[PDB]
Design a protein around this nucleic acid. Structure first.
Lengths: 130, 259, 125, 108
RNA sequence: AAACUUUCAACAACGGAUCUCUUGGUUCUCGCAUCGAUGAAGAACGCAGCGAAAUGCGAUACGUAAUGUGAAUUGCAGAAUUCCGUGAAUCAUCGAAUCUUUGAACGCACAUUGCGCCCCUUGGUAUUCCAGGGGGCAUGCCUGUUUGAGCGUCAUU
RNA sequence: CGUGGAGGUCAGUGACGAAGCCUAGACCGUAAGGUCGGGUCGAACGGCCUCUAGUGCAGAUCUUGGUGGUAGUAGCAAGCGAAACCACAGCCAAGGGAACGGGCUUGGCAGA
RNA sequence: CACGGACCAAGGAGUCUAACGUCUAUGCGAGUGUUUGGGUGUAAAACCCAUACGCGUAAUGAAAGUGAACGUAGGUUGGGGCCUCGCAAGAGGUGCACAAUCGACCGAUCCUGAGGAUGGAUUUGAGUAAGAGCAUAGCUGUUGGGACCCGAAAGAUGGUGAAAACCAUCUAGUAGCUGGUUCCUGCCGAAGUUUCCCUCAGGAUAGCAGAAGCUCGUAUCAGUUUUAUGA
RNA sequence: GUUUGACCUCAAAUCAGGUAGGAGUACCCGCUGAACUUAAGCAUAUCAAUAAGCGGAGGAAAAGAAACCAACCGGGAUUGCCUUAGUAACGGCGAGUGAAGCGGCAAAAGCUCAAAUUUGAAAUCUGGUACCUUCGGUGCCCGAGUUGUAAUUUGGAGAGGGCAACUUUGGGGCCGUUCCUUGUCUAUGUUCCUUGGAACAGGACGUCAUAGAGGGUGAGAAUCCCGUGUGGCGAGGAGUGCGGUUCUUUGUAAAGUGCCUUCGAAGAGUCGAGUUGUUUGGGAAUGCAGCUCUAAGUGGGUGGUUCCAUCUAAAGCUAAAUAUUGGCGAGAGACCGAUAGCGAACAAGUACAGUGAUGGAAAGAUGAAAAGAACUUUGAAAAGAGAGUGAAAAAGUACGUGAAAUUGUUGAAAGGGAAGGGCAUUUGAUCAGACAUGGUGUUUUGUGCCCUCUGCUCCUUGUGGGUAGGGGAAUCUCGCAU
């Protein structure tokens, strides 16, 4: 070759890259419980059977719980705004619990929300307050 | 190369020029001008039948025939005379086929692993190798085939516990998992009967791997092949009580010269 | 046996790498062993070689002769030991090109980075 | 004239590709849960094969939603139709079994 | 008989076969995506104490700075270096520099090392002018910006 | 039978001289060739059971390289110095069936 | 006659592949074929395998169909072998493959016409007799690939030069041909041509020389003589 | 208002910010397009939806989420492989050309516009400028933009509300893991003897091995050096993949799900039609282009025997599986070994030749180290002679081995107008030609593995083996020595 002949001849050197070992021994990255329980001497499919978890959901072409309990372990384990709360205080002190009067009201209930909207927000308000 | 020999701009000089009709290079004042190209006989010319990539390199074999061969190769490892003929200094080994205890697999260090074989009796076979290290006799020296040595024992294990690494430095010693068992390892150079050190667990597993009368096979729809004879020796049949009873009397093995 | 896929067991690649090695790599390639006395003191097998240190020649025609290194000829992969000299026909003196694998160091030349080099390799000065 | 010299090479390529996908998609099974489908044409109708994707109908009958189905790794097809009754039953049972097996990790 | 011619043998010549080697080639496989108006690929002129190609480099010119290594370079000559350290080296790395004349080649030009213009300007009082230093002025097109032009359209108590 | 390389084997041979090269040297094989002595050499090589192929030369007005006769000739408009060409040699008579006599047959003859 | 040979060294020519066969070997066998792939691996090796597919396993036809036992899957005759007798020589029985003869089943015929029933007329068949294939390898043939090696008059594409050209590729262009084709020994061993395709060209065949399988090993014949019986 | 002011359009500038060209080109995407050659001459078939030329891209490209295939107990983006298959089909049925659906597998991922109003508030963006934690954020100003920029929707529908006493919830640092680049540490003889210049060889004696790949070192080195093998300690970067660690989360905010209620628009000089060419093996001109005319909305496209099935064109995006004689960087070989292998292992696309496009070689090896021959001497120079270095110059910068042709010298032989060859022999020259030495039968003695006394030890069947201490030849040839 023309260009390769110069690169071998020059005193610049070549951008030598040794990256063939890393193409096989790939570290697991996305789960810490797996990161501890993964034998790199074994293959992909062999590591899955060792754990318990399925490696393939289809019937595979060709031929052929210590860890899974720890995954079930990690499976065992919103408020309202200041204006919204203060606005609900105005409605409750005015009417009480008359939602029909509350939604036919114009001065306090400006955005013409339904009975179901106002009462739901009042239930959340009655949890944080009286 | 596809280009080699075609990287010239030669032209045939024509008829009646009092010179051979081989296509000669044009130009002038170079030395290469007025000389032969495009010809197998010519210097710097293109070779006859340029070797192409699409030659049949790999060989398709019947899977059953291939299995037959490995079974034959295994069978020949347990003969002792066949092993001695093949090479392998197996005079001072306790029995054939040689089976060592399963604790051989667990050995981590090469020093301890070679001490196991030396205690068994493969000492002489491991001295056959190491003393047989010679330079390659060809152009193989400068094609990464510099050294050549004799084949030592195979060490067959059921499952590894550091044995593959323990023996991968002691020269000649090859290991194989029983599930595999390579033909190229079992019969090197198409000569039967390598000296095979089996392990206890491997030897028991060999029943499962191939099969017998009682056990199944573990290979799908495979059975071990039947003998077309009953006995591998003829002379028990011929020198029987039976055959020698239904037979006419004997000659001298060499005729007395009549006239 | 080779296990890594990164390293090459090719003869052609290896001989080229050696003969077209730079001066810095040739410093490491020209390493000498230490004598049994220094190995007992410092707790180290071998070091790269320099100028102002003493040496004893083990193998060759100049067997058993000793001296002090004049100049490390890294280009020719050689050392030139002073007082290990071949006398020319004109009365002049020409140093023999020895190789540092054949030499053995008897008395090191300890500098600051040399002390650090010993301490790195598991030494005890 | 092409020759496939790289049959051994590309199997090692494909295996290492699956190995990377295993490393990056750590707990998950590399591929999506595909349906079970009856093949077309008189010749092949006896054969029952892996289909492309389920349906909105099969997903809805299983007890989950279409957009959510894809996030849990169920392949969903929208052009496929549920004409057959036996195929519909087999796929619904396949999903419900799959839903008993799955363990969807929290987002905290 | 000698000489001469021829044959054989021995010793010289001539030639570079054979053998052996090999920092080269060829083929297969694997991985990665990385040129250019911030001026590339290419051409030319040069540059080292002493150089042909090659390699490196651009008036900072077989280099400068930076980082690491730790004491050479060596074909020859000659300098060095405080060598318990900001440090030898045609060392490695390479991110900061300079980067001649050209070349898509880009101020105007044809094949003129000519023909200029503007800005910044240190010097020769420099108010005249003279010289030096430094950066720009190609084409097309997009987003703007701006001074306009247009009986192109409308408004106008 | 032989050559380049591959697997196997001979715990083969080998700086006390491998391979190669010669040799008015010896032995074996009908032969292809194989083995040995002597001389020269300086680093690898061979037999055996198998594998594989760019494997064996007298020719192609063969390709490449080298070296002759021609010739110290033609020549330069005592020295310098080719080329064309080249199976091999060049006495006559007679016979050699076949528009074939230059090698044969029978004679004449023939001195460097 | 003519073409080749001054001499010497080295180089130098039936190769590789695909398609389709031949025979032999090996594996298994009504099946057979792992190697597109997946799993695994001491890593292009080796070792495992899912679902399919390839080819074969049950035929007779033209649009529409039907379907193989009167059966020791036949009656006879032979027929390698085997059994009884005989010292043998022979005789008798059972008879494989195979061959000859008589037929049948199935489909298809010539009719009879209850849409084609029914009975007769006969033959027909890579038909059934009651499966032999598939795959690998070796030997080799046929055809295409540059195709044993070298050698011809060319066109086209794109470019360079110039008071009709050259360069580079297509192009290793195509040959109804010329020259050359590389080790030894043993054994067998021709032909010089029949007849039409018309021949001219290339062949289609028979003859001469083999290869293998099958019956026999004989009374199978002979470039011959003799007797017998004709023009 | 005979001023002036909105716009639209055309300008401008050495303004501000950008960007396009060229090289490379193996692969890919377009455009253009021969001839030698095959069937018999050549218009198709055929070379060939080739080569050259032209334009354009990338790490891949292209293709792609159906206006699809089907006729089934339906499949379901695209790409590739296996197979379908040398089948259907076409071809003066001939040179032959040559698919596709299904099936197995590789890899799998989907979505964004245009479409009916944010109209109770252009909710959007560019740019300038000022700061900030700078691949950007924020304030302010400017412009674009209603000839429509944001949010909401893309048929899988969707939206408007209502009911669930429904369900879910951002973002920024910090230290780790991970990825990239780079540095550094990690076993064991230079132990004896022989030979050689030299030990890396032979022999004896040992160690290490997750290291006996490879390379160097004065010849074949696991153990001399570098590495190799298994591990460890780092430095500088990348980064949203997640682990932890926190700092802040807000607004009547952003969705999701089921039920009930009211609506509910989907691409035109395009589809199609005739014709002239191109494309194919395409039989239902397939595909495309040119030219003429040019639609519909309980629509339209495509297929199956009178209906039925199947999608929704005329807009767009998208990884992976796939290609790769280039580039960048590796790892290899039943490859070639200097007339081979690339043209080039070396001052090689160099020397050189051609006006020019272009054509284009030859040429590797001294030794371990130059120790490259000092110094005397022969000659103006060219080369020699003594002498020396080295293991060897019987290795000399004409340099490893040094073949044949061919040339000289010397020696031997032969030669009256041919030699070389075969059978046989003489003469001349010359080379082979035992470190061969006993064999047998008796006789002195002297020893031992012999007789005899006492034992010890390995194992398998009697028909064992190894190995000590004493004695004794007057019996014994049992062996070996004289």
């Amino acid at each position: 070759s023309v260009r390769k002949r110069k690169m071998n001849r020059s005193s610049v050197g070549k951008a030598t890259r040794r990256n063939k070992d890393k193409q096989r021994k790939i570290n697991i990255q996305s789960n810490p419980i797996i990161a501890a329980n993964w034998d790199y001497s074994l293959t992909m499919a062999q590591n899955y059977k060792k754990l318990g978890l399925r490696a393939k959901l289809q019937t595979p072409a060709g031929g052929k719980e210590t860890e899974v309990v720890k995954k079930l372990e990690e499976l065992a384990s919103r408020s309202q705004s200041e204006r919204e709360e203060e606005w609900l205080e105005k409605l409750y002190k005015k009417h009480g619990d008359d939602y029909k009067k509350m939604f036919f009201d114009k001065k306090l209930n400006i955005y013409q929300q339904s009975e179901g909207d106002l009462k739901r927000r009042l239930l959340r308000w009655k949890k944080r307050n009286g | 190369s596809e280009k080699a020999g075609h990287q010239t701009s030669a032209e045939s000089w024509g008829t009646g020029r009092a010179v051979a009709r081989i296509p000669r290079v044009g130009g002038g004042g170079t030395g290469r001008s007025g000389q032969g190209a495009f010809g197998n006989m010519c210097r710097g010319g293109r070779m006859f039948a340029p070797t192409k990539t699409w030659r049949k390199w790999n060989v398709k074999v019947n899977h059953n025939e291939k299995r037959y061969a490995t079974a034959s190769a295994i069978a020949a490892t347990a003969v002792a005379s066949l092993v001695l003929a093949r090479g392998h200094r197996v005079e001072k080994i306790p029995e054939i086929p040689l089976v060592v205890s399963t604790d051989l697999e667990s050995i981590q260090k090469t020093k301890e692993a070679v001490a196991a074989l030396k205690a068994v009796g493969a000492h002489s076979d491991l001295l056959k190798v190491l003393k047989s290290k010679k330079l390659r006799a060809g152009k193989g020296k400068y094609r990464n085939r510099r050294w050549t040595q004799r084949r030592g024992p195979l060490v067959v294990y059921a499952e590894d516990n550091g044995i593959v690494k323990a023996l991968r430095n002691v020269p000649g010693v090859e290991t194989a998992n029983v599930a595999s068992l390579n033909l190229l390892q079992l019969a090197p150079g198409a000569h039967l009967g390598r000296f095979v050190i089996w392990t206890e667990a491997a030897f028991t597993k060999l029943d499962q791997v191939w099969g017998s009368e009682t056990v199944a096979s573990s290979k799908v729809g495979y059975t071990l092949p039947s003998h077309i004879i009953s006995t591998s020796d003829v002379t028990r049949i011929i020198n029987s009580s039976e055959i020698q009873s239904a037979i006419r009397p004997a000659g001298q093995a060499t005729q007395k010269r009549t006239h | 046996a080779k296990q890594s896929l990164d390293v090459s067991s090719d003869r052609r690649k290896a001989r080229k790498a050696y003969f077209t090695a730079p001066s810095s790599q040739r410093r490491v390639l020209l390493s000498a062993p230490l004598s049994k006395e220094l190995r007992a003191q410092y707790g180290i097998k071998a070091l790269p070689i320099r100028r102002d240190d003493e040496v004893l020649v083990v193998r060759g025609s100049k067997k058993g002769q000793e001296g002090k290194i004049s100049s490390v000829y890294r280009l020719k992969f050689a050392v030139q030991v002073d007082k290990v000299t071949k006398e020319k026909v004109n009365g002049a003196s020409v140093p023999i090109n020895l190789h540092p694998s054949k030499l053995v160091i008897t008395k090191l030349h300890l500098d600051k980075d040399r002390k650090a080099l010993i301490q790195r390799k598991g030494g005890k000065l | 004239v092409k020759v496939h010299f790289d049959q051994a090479g590309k199997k090692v390529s494909r295996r290492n590709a699956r190995a990377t996908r295993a490393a990056k998609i750590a707990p998950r099974p590399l591929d999506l849960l595909r349906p079970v489908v009856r093949a077309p044409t008189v010749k092949y109708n006896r054969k029952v094969r892996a289909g492309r994707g389920f349906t909105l109908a099969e997903v809805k009958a299983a007890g989950l939603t279409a957009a959510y189905a894809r996030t849990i790794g169920i392949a969903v097809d929208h052009r496929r139709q549920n004409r057959n009754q036996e195929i519909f039953d087999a796929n619904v049972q396949r999903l419900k079994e799959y839903q008993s097996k799955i363990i969807v990790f929290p987002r905290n």
